[PDB]
Amino acid sequence: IDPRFPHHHPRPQSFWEARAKALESLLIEKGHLSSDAIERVIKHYEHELGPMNGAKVVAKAWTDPAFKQRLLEDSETVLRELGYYGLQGEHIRVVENTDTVHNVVVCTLCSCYPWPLLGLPPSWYKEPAYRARVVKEPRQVLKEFGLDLPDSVEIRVWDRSSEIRFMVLPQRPEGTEGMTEEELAKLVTRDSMIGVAKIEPP
Amino acid sequence: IDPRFPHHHPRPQSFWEARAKALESLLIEKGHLSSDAIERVIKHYEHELGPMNGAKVVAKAWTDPAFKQRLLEDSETVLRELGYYGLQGEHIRVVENTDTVHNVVVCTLCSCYPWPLLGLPPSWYKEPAYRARVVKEPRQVLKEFGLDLPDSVEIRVWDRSSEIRFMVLPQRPEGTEGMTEEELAKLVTRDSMIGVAKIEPP
Amino acid sequence: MNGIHDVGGMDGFGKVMYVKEEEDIYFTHDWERLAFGLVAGCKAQGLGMKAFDEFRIGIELMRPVDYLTSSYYGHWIATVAYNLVDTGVLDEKELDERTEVFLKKPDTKIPRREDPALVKLVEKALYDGLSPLREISASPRFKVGERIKAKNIHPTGHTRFPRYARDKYGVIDEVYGAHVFPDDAAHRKGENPQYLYRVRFEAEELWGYKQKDSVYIDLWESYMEPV
Amino acid sequence: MNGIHDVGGMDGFGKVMYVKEEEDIYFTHDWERLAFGLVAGCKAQGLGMKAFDEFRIGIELMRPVDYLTSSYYGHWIATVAYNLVDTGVLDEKELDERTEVFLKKPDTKIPRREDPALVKLVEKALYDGLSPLREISASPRFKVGERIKAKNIHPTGHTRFPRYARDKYGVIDEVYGAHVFPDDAAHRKGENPQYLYRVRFEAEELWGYKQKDSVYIDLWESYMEPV
Ligand SMILES: [Cl-]
Ligand SMILES: [Cl-]
Ligand SMILES: [Co+2]
Ligand SMILES: [Co+2]
């Protein structure tokens, strides 16, 4: 390494791995962490949370006009009553896609995402391409997801610069007549609750 | 390489090396380049040009008031008359450091530098730290070079966004009484002609 | 800070890597799982960080070349290390030595310890969260519908004001209430809560572009001024 | 393009690596020397690039992770490759295959050829340079001393208008004359020369900072509008 150019040389991912283990070891030795505390977190985020919670909220909104009304009027109270609350989900708002308004959520500065309601964010959501581009050329970004909106549809991008979180409420597709709330929930995709996809007819 | 994350993985410098050789080989095979054309360029930039040319211009300005006047009035004509002209030196301007005005030159967008007059730029001149910072906190950048200007001195940063080039004309230091033009030229540093240093008394 | 993290409006980062949800694996390496445990475990106890503000600045401070190559949980490792050293929980020399141990001997045994009280404490944190909403005695400076000036400010420390939105006109969409102020809190300078607003910006104003696009950004009161 | 290259005003890139001039080695690897020969040799003949505009956009288009890690002459290799393929001088498949050859067998022999006519041609280019100054029939829109508005424009192709200077007020310092217009020329869309101006911006205006600092930037006429 030429000392003029240390900034050309990234840490290898083996460094981060070693660093993680070093932190883990030191913190447990010092009594700050325990094996079971670390595992409890991993269980929560890898297994206990997921987009199925948001899916249930969407299906309920589709099937129960009074619920949808309450949700849109005061989402934070309603979501907390359902138990979809916690770390990074203390203040969750809901915005409805309509025929002429399309909503897209992003954290340009990092990755902010409502874990208690949606689970962990998509891989791409945290990466620079989506973050950089969606606030400036959302139509181009959406097209890469297969969503080609007409010029006449307004796009609203919601950049999560504070701890306020947003979920998109996507429209119920055609072809779903007679489906139960539980069956509609299975239609609701993670991507549709971020705004990068509409829901396909069954 | 996880295909979600190809952008995490830089080309190694061995790639650029191989690419360079591949270009060289193909272009010579196709009759576009020759061994001697490539060598001629390397000789010019590594050996024929350098900051000594600017140093001579500075020393002349210090020793010949009429020359300094002409240089400051019409640098492009004067420099061309001296033969300090060529690729990336077609339009060269000169700005004088004074007791209350300090000049610093940068190419924030790349590396633009007057090769015919000063030779190749410093390593650091082309790198992000200098480029990013000097337009916003020049006092902090200058301090890293050992130049700690008083608040009362105005700083003018000249960002080379066009093909117009600038050389800084630094002030003649104390302690140089009786020195010849040739001896003064040996005092003129590359850094002083960029604006990141004053010239020390001998 | 005007850092590599602040990517909104940048060109050149390429196509978005679309992947079907069911194929979008959360973790591919155990150290990534561990990173999550470290962050949440420390935060639950206020070790190195109490809210996300301090967490974010540690990431923002990464070398750009590291930020772009570490992978996402690499950011988390970087900021835990940064903050634990910065607050005096860990010593840098000891951390570096131990890092070296695991670099040269990756299969080095991790010490085991069960602490069910700590588990309950961490669990409580995951479920209770930590709201930054506060009450203050002042009234909001701005009103819904007001056209405001998003200031041209350039803090060298932490901010939540993306560069792409600076020096722009926008319209107040909502007054959320007073929230802990990141530009102070990230540097352990007090909660000093300020009114937080949602502000709508038009594409024409942000970019000079002609499509029916807008961006809704949350801005603290001190980021803005009246017109 | 709002790319990784456009670093003016960014925080986080760290200290400047000071080195004494006499110790500041130009080249540490032969491929770096070769990069210079490739660029100047091609440019002298108008191969891939005729002026520096096309040269710059090829660098600006690099993957950010490459831009930050390739080292400086790596940029030059990237843009020669880009432009020679883009203009049809070289075929991408052939270039990639040959790259692979030198990757696996670095000591592969380089073909030798002497072309003294080409040497003279290259030499002429090094000494004669290539001025972008033109004359146009129009008069300048702006005058020395005029307070202008540096527009909020966001071209997705090449521009010489740094982002830090956009959406700002400045003062005309000089009218240089008409120069070949980079935003068109880099994309082979004609010289279409426009008046080029030097414009002074104050620290207070660029950053909201309070020191006696200013930046003099060269801006093409179409980057600005009257107030
Ligand atoms: Cl929808
Ligand atoms: Cl001086
Ligand atoms: Co975030
Ligand atoms: Co340059």
From TrEMBL, chains A, B:
Residues 16-197 form the Nitrile hydratase alpha/Thiocyanate hydrolase gamma domain. Fe(3+) binds at C107, C110, S111, C112. The modification Cysteine sulfinic acid (-SO2H) is found at C110, C112. It catalyses: an aliphatic primary amide = an aliphatic nitrile + H2O. Its EC number is 4.2.1.84. Keywords: Iron, Lyase, Metal-binding. Mg(2+) binds at I164. GO terms for molecular function: nitrile hydratase activity; transition metal ion binding. It is an enzyme of class 4 (lyase). Belongs to the nitrile hydratase subunit alpha family. This is nitrile hydratase. The lineage of its organism: Bacteria, Bacillati, Bacillota, Bacilli, Bacillales.
Automatic annotation (TrEMBL), chains C, D:
It is an enzyme of class 4 (lyase). It catalyses: an aliphatic primary amide = an aliphatic nitrile + H2O. InterPro entries: CN_hydtase_beta-like_N, CN_hydtase_beta_C, CN_hydtase_beta_dom_C, Elect_transpt_acc-like_dom_sf, Nitrile_hydratase_bsu. Residues 132-226 form the Nitrile hydratase beta subunit domain. GO terms for molecular function: nitrile hydratase activity; transition metal ion binding. Residues 1-113 form the Nitrile hydratase beta subunit-like N-terminal domain. The keyword Lyase applies. It comes from the Bacteria. Its EC number is 4.2.1.84. The keyword Heme does not apply. Keywords: Lyase, Metal-binding. Pfam families: NHase_beta_C (PF02211), NHase_beta_N (PF21006). Mg(2+) binds at D218. NHase catalyzes the hydration of various nitrile compounds to the corresponding amides. Belongs to the nitrile hydratase subunit beta family. This is Nitrile hydratase subunit beta.
